[PDB]
Design a protein around this ligand. Structure first.
Ligand code: CL
Ligand code: CL
Lengths: 214, 219
């Protein structure tokens, strides 16, 4: 299968440059165009430009010609996008996408800010009687982190039934929080394993928090 | 730029019923090579866009037969014969005939379904968070519809004002419901000074408001 695997999230200061990568597999890298796309609230999906790895040909959106430089490495089947003179307007999720947008990477979140990273505090939402008939609830609170993103799974992704992960919300005083909950049969309380896996790559914070009745 | 104008911007559909989204391009998308480089993409919340339709009417592999694409020139339509719960998301048209390639603003497809009351759950602050010097009391409203709900906090029977924040999930891709978290934020000292913590929920699907509560120290 075709795979486009992008590099991890980035926090960079205003005025800096950053280089994002898109490592491909499952097709001949040299023979398909690679596009880059920006997604930012209020701007929507914007095409930055494309590069043809076989000969280095490029086409840029005039809006990004002074901002972005596309290159490729045929040896590693990887496409790169360098963004320079960064400002807050450059904060966005960036995607690589092949050909006529037929396959997409998972995205890279870029935050342009003078702030430093701050990892989340991860707290259990402990089940009890007070968390309905034959259904109980449990969860994890992921509090006061910066920048986006954070990923949350349960039991390394093996648990998906009954899982609700709430959106990250930027709080008034500048940090993000979210939560993730699971509803389960009340019989499962204290008997089944529930581990919330939290990964905040910008701060290198990885937490695997076992959630048990209080 | 070629401007891609989609209509409607929000589409509210009952499961099992047809839906359509149209796209107008400001220049013809017919290319000199005879092809019309119009595609449709779907993006689910927290995921990358996925292509569904290309060259106006061709279906990508794995895309259900209920999706069809049509049109020519500057006017195109994406049709869904019967909307399933998993069709929710934002649909974009996109053109690759003219540089710069451009995308529509997106049409959010949301599902209509019957009223469902929330199940309600309340969580004291964790000992770990208290040991860390802060306190969050959380009330969860799970699997309800419609999205609108009222959550009222009472501490020792005193109505709370301005010290809670609610967050709502995206619509569920299987049962089309929502879930909502309400966090009551107090200092640890304030938390330890009061006893009864209650969240009261009123929703169209509840005949009467539902209250969940706990007493600090009554484990
Ligand atoms: Cl990692
Ligand atoms: Cl109804």
């Amino acid at each position: 299968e075709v795979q486009l695997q992008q590099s991890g999230p980035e926090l960079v200061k205003p005025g800096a440059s950053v280089k994002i990568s898109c490592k491909t597999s499952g097709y001949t890298f040299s023979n398909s165009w690679m596009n880059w796309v920006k997604q930012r609230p209020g701007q929507g999906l914007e095409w930055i430009g494309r590069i043809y790895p076989g000969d280095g040909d490029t086409n840029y959106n005039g809006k990004f010609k002074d901002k972005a430089t596309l290159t490729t490495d045929k040896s590693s089947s990887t496409a790169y996008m360098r963004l320079s003179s960064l400002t807050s307007v450059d904060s966005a999720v960036y995607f690589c996408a092949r050909s006529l947008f037929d396959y997409w990477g998972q995205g890279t979140t870029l935050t342009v800010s003078s702030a430093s990273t701050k990892g989340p505090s991860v707290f259990p939402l402990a089940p009890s009687s007070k968390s309905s008939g034959g259904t109980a609830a449990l969860g994890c609170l992921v509090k006061d982190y910066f920048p986006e993103p954070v990923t949350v799974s349960w039991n390394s992704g093996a648990l998906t039934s009954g899982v609700h992960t709430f959106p990250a919300v930027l709080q008034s005083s500048g940090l993000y929080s979210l939560s993730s909950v699971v509803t389960v049969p009340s019989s499962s309380l204290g008997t089944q394993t529930y581990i919330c896996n939290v990964n905040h790559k910008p701060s290198n914070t990885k937490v695997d928090k076992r959630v048990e009745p209080k | 730029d070629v401007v891609m104008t989609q209509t409607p911007l929000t589409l509210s559909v009952t499961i099992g019923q047809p839906a359509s989204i149209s796209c107008k391009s400001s220049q013809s998308l017919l290319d000199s090579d005879g092809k019309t480089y119009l595609i449709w993409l779907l993006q689910r919340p927290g995921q990358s866009p996925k292509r569904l339709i290309y060259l106006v009417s061709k279906l990508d592999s794995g895309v259900p037969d209920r999706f069809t694409g049509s049109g020519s020139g500057t006017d195109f339509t994406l049709k869904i014969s019967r909307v399933e719960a998993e069709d929710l998301g934002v649909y974009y048209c996109c053109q690759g005939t003219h540089f710069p390639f451009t995308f529509g603003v997106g049409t959010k497809l949301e599902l209509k379904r019957t009223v469902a009351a929330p199940s309600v759950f309340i969580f004291p602050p964790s000992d770990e968070q208290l040991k860390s010097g802060t306190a969050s009391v959380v009330c969860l409203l799970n699997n309800f519809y419609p999205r609108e709900a009222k959550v009222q906090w009472k501490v020792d029977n005193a109505l709370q004002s301005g010290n809670s924040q609610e967050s709502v999930t995206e619509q569920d891709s299987k049962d089309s419901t929502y879930s909502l978290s309400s966090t009551l934020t107090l200092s640890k000292a304030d938390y330890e000074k009061h006893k009864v913590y209650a969240c009261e929920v009123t929703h169209q699907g509840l005949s009467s408001p539902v209250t969940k509560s706990f007493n600090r120290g009554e484990c």
